[PDB]
Structure 1
């Protein structure tokens, strides 16, 4: 089905934003379920609710705190999308991913995407942090892909390969940094799988996902990632683990979202220090820097 948004539509929204803030972003950060904390630390903050920005999808119902704060963070200047969009919310996939495209028109040349995810690996302990190395997009195998439709050769190719989705150096540079702060627990790596559904995962299901080779399940990021790469954005991101089951031979836990708690603890504080430091290793342009 078409992409309602019309190139002119992303143009008008890039220019407008670009004409209301004297900040020319370089990095776009997308924070998820208990990582809006990463906001505060911006320095020359400048906030625009998703409501003024002309074509931006207004955020539905939650804690509502969903705005787009512009600022400078640890040397590089960036954009912070605080409270993103998911499928389970009823959004066509070209709506959730509108953010990522205006960004590309903004100047941005890096896209770091966080998200509070599952944890389907026995080695991970709630609270950890997983360096997304790859993804398994199940909603994409079926036709639900943000690129499904005619293509705007102004943005990217028709058949972009995702083989190298998440940058390599940025991931070594992150891998290093972790060492470099003298940190207790190690920042892991694995592959992430997007499940779309609002409800949580059956023990029966949690075993296919493990079987398929995923490491942490979730309901976001794969779209924004896919359309970033389409643009030649340099992507890469972390996943903050918070749980998961595997036993029906009999258990007696479940896994709520009340547990925005897990992230709503020091998983937050940590993931902030960790991305503030990382700003310092993102190749800046200028005239070769």
Structure 2
């Protein structure tokens, strides 16, 4: 196997963008679950369809939106590419690399996830302190292939992927919104989906020590870290994954969208305020 892309391609995508916009973003945001709205908190918002950008994986609704969120230069991904849609991981995470070359130095990723930790409840937000990359164990790692040392090393470390500074500086930000539910922290486990877990699979993931399970994010994290970006991320718990054979309930997408729009308020503000904890550059 190898990456369909050459260093020149990432480069060429960045230069194209660097000449179709004035924005010089510092922060990449990859939204999942009702952070769709974030668009309207941006100002000086310039949209580009994925379809117009040279080299961009080809989905539908997908766009890059540059602008300012709370005095920070951002680029947000609206719509993303998942492994379960059949993309190889080197297309899943193509954008992260285009970001690094745009000059971005931080990544914020968010997602929906089922809660495996029994404490959690629908609506909780969980900070990601760590991950378990199950597709990665088997070979599905976005860095598989020849390494380009213009991005990073052959063997990067992931023990420190999720910036400790950003995690404290996001706990602070939660107090100063006065919330009833407390901010959660924990391990996100990636699995490839697209079907949902059995009870027995749920039990497996709880025994491994995961707190939430989704079908994204980790690969973009690994590529971010390979590149030198600072990473911060979190999960909206949209459902408590089913764990006994008694329950007549079932995980479904209505539940996930339902919950997404429910936290739409909470989140856009939460992320928007977090912008101020991101140190400027120079």
TM class by smaller structure: over 0.9
Shift of 1:182: 1.5
Write the deviation string for residues 161-203 of structure 1: whole angstroms up to 9, x where unpaired.
Answer: 1000000011100011101122221111010000101000000
Q: Do 2:239 and 2:256's aligned partners in 1 also have CA atoms closer than 8 Å?
A: no
How far apart are residue 137 of structure 1 and its match?
Answer: 0.4
The one of 248, 251, 254 aligned to 1:255: 251
CA change 1:77–1:111 in 2 (3 A) is same
Residue 248 of structure 1: CA displacement? 3.4
TM-score, L = length of structure 2: 0.98
The residue that corresponds to 2:270 in the other structure is 274
Contact 2:122–2:259 under 8 Å retained in 1 = no
- Greater shift in the superposed pair: 4-13 or 174-183: 174-183
State the distance in 2 between where 1:274 and 1:83 align: 20
Structure 2 CA distance, aligned partners of 1:80 and 1:208? 34
What SS does structure 1 have at the residue aligned with 2:159? coil
Q: Are 1:130 and 1:240, in contact at CA under 8 Å, matched by a contact in 2? A: yes
Q: Which runs of 4+ in 1 moved over 4 A?
A: none
8 A contact 1:29–1:112 mirrored in 2:
yes
Q: Which moved more, 1:263-272 or 1:156-165?
A: 263-272
Aligned twin of 2:204 = 208
State the distance in 2 between where 1:157 and 1:89 align.
29
The structure with the greater share of residues assigned to strand is 2
For 1:207 and 1:131, the matched residues in 2 are separated by: 22
Normalised by the length of structure 1, the TM-score is 0.95
- 1:36 CA drift (Å): 1.2
- Per-residue deviation, 1:33: 3.0
Deviations 1:216-240 (A, max 9, x none): 0000000000000000100011110
Tell me if structure 2 keeps the 8 A contact 1:117–1:240: yes
Cα drift, residue 260 of structure 1 = 3.3
Q: CA deviation at 1:244?
A: 2.7
Deviation at 1:65, TM superposition (A): 2.3
Contact 1:34 1:260 in 2 (8 A): no
Unaligned runs of 5+ in 1: none
2-structure distance, mates of 1:35, 1:279: 15
The one-character-per-residue Cα deviations of 1:71-130 (angstroms, maximum 9, x if unpaired) are 111011100001111100000000010010000000000000000111101111100100
Q: In structure 2, how many angstroms separate the alpha carbons of the residues matched to 1:143 and 1:261?
A: 31
Cα distance in 2 for partners of 1:43, 1:263 equals 26
Q: Distance in 2 between matches of 1:110 and 1:203?
A: 37
Which residue does 1:30 correspond to in 2?
30
- CA distance in structure 2 between the partners assigned to 1:74 and 1:243 by the alignment: 30
Displacement of 1:46: 0.5
Match for 1:134 among 110, 124, 130?
130
Please state how far the C-alpha of 1:266 moved relative to its aligned partner.
Answer: 2.7
Q: What is the Cα deviation at residue 259 of structure 1?
A: 2.3
